[PDB]
Write a protein that binds this ligand. Structure first.
Ligand SMILES: CC(C)(COP(=O)(O)OP(=O)(O)OC[C@H]1O[C@@H](n2cnc3c(N)ncnc32)[C@H](O)[C@@H]1OP(=O)(O)O)[C@@H](O)C(=O)NCCC(=O)NCCS
Length: 447
């Protein structure tokens, strides 16, 4: 009745919409696959009208065009998480990066630390009552809507209706630009030998009726392919991808055994191919919720037999875990890695487990092999998951237990799970570091 006039009255072009942004403004984007590409390209196109507009967001599948050097006087990129197309700028010095736990984002917005002048969002078209769906995010996207002084909507009819806190009434949105284009999509990873091995070991720590979290990154997929014998698995996770769909139609994941959000896969956001968005649409077995629910340590602590599984770049001899930087170079963020390490530990049922997984080696550019197991982290790296937070660590060669184990015994476990061709250099490094023989009991048969 009134909502359609409101809608009809606020409909414009991407060009005029981006005129709500003024110099000095903090601008924020909807998360991930809810980033409005037309509303973004419009804003970039009109660069030459802005002076130091902060452009915040997290992981992105767009061109990060605003973070390029040329734009350094119209935009300051201020990432809360980075990705290939925006961490250029943090390295070169004109882009910014803010370390935040993912679950804390909504709060900081409420607090007005992350102040928002213009949130831009992609939502689907209104239903009969005038509620657009974000469909593909919830994360901070819901709080930013309530808190943004101005909200631009890139209404795209390709966006799904997905149950949960995904809804926004047209009355909450200052401008609408109707579009039509496919949503972005990531590639499936190559599940090789190393991938497969990391898989089965994680699969030996998941018991039937486990609830799972599976973070951004390649590795939690080879895991999923190793889970086919599992029964009654449930989901409570930041995100889920195509791998989770396979397991769900293979009858393994059914959430019949959860303590909270019974019968549902509870997620904060979706990223994947179109098979995933289509599956998630109008599906009672999926519910998107805000991150300061999904990622909240207190809430994760309530999950049943929780197995978190995330990835890292390197690990040191104390079990300090580095997941978002290579030396002084910023690469991603904590995102939710720590949120689910904290929550699995606080498990009320006492059964929580967090698994950080990684190949033991990585290739460099000169083609030299390097150990991801190190005496010491790379100069200037950020400790992501601290030694006190550490739990399970997992490579192609095995599992190592960091929880309640001494500095010496952790180093022993990790060396255990390292590429054989590095064990002996790692062993020398042990003895140097700790002023103690690598091998603990000694035999009279020698010296
Ligand atoms: C750990 C993380 C960065 C890995 O993601 P990924 O896409 O699986 O990353 P990769 O293993 O491809 O590593 C990236 C590259 O750096 C290199 N690399 C990895 N570890 C390295 C190390 N210790 N030293 C130097 N280089 C390294 C690899 O060679 C790799 O290949 P490329 O250079 O050919 O592209 C990612 O999962 C992440 O950002 N994690 C933290 C956030 C998190 O856990 N969030 C939960 C939210 S759902």
């Amino acid at each position: 009745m009134d909502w359609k006039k409101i809608y009809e009255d606020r409909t414009c072009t991407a060009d005029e919409a981006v005129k709500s942004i003024k110099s000095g403004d903090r601008v924020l984007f909807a998360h991930c696959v809810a980033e409005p590409p037309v509303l973004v390209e419009a804003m970039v196109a009109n660069a030459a009208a802005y002076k130091n507009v902060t452009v915040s967001h997290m992981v992105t599948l767009g061109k990060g065009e605003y973070s390029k050097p040329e734009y350094k006087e119209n935009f300051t990129f201020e990432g809360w998480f980075t990705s290939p197309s925006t961490r250029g700028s943090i390295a070169e010095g004109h882009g910014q990066f803010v370390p935040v736990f993912f679950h804390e984002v909504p709060s900081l917005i409420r607090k007005d630390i992350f102040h928002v002048d213009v949130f831009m969002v992609m939502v689907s078209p209104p239903d009969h009552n005038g509620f657009c769906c974000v469909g593909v995010s919830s994360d901070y996207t819901m709080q930013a809507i309530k808190s943004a002084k101005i909200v631009l909507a890139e209404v795209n009819d390709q966006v799904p209706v997905v149950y949960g806190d995904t809804f926004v009434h047209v009355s909450e949105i200052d401008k609408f630009v109707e579009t039509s284009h496919p949503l972005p999509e990531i590639g499936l990873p190559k599940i090789g030998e190393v991938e497969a091995a990391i898989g089965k070991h994680c699969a030996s720590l998941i018991e039937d009726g486990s609830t799972l979290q599976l973070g951004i990154g390649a590795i939690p997929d080879a895991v999923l392919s190793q889970l086919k014998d599992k029964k009654h698995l449930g989901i409570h996770s930041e995100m889920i991808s195509d791998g989770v769909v396979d397991l769900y139609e293979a009858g393994v994941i059914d959430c019949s055994q959860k303590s909270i959000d019974k019968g549902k896969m509870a997620i904060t956001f979706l990223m994947g191919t179109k098979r995933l968005y289509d599956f998630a649409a109008n599906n009672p077995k999926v519910e998107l919720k805000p991150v300061d629910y999904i990622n909240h340590p207190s809430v994760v602590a309530q999950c049943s037999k929780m197995v978190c599984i995330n990835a890292c770049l390197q690990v040191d001899f104390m079990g300090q875990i580095v997941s978002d930087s290579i030396g002084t170079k910023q690469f991603s963020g904590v995102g939710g890695q720590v949120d689910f390490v904290r929550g699995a530990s606080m498990s009320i049922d006492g059964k929580g487990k967090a698994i950080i997984a990684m190949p033991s080696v990585a290739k460099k550019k000169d083609g030299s092999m390097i150990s991801k197991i190190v005496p010491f982290i790379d100069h200037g790296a950020a400790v992501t998951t601290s030694r006190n937070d550490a739990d399970y660590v997992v490579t192609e060669y095995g599992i190592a237990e960091m929880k309640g184990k001494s500095l010496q015994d952790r180093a022993r476990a990790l060396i255990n799970i390292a590429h054989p061709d590095f064990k002996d250099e790692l062993k020398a490094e042990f003895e140097k570091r700790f002023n103690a023989a690598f091998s603990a009991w000694s035999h009279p048969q020698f010296e």
